[PDB]
Design brief:
This is CRISPR-associated protein Cmr3. Helix content is 3%, strand content 42%. It is built from one helix and eleven strands; from the N terminus they run E-E-E-E-E-E-E-E-H-E-E-E. It binds one RNA strand of 37 nucleotides through strand 10.
Amino acid sequence: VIKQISPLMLIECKDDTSSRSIYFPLPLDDGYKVSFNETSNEDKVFYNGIECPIPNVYPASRKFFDHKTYNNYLFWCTQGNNQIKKLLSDEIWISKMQIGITKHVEEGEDNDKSFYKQEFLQLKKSFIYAFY
RNA sequence: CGCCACUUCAUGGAAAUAAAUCACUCACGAAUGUCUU
């Protein structure tokens, strides 16, 4: 009976529980302009041997792509009635590392080798998962 | 030469002062760094 499942969504539920904000990962090109100048014979990238035009990139605010300041991969985004709201992944997900062992019950087992660390994630109080 | 006793019974000063006030050592050691379905 299952026919169609939507991609899992990150939904924010506010105190005024009448509207929900859907959060998406920030596009990797956000805040930057990519042109691909086509004057030809200028410069061609070879991605593992395939022809491709050169990706001229500028911030949408010139200078070039400074990968020392590139941080779009750390941000999640949602629609606002203005610009795009950027939320850090830190502010959404809380992470803790848990140490675990199996208590050595003697008269048996070669299991001193039971020793591990696990990562557990907690969602912020206003954030839930959803899909259709 | 004889005769004969009274008076006085602790005041002042010092009443604690300096030195050391914790020292050295150990401040985590060994096992497990994944295992069984």
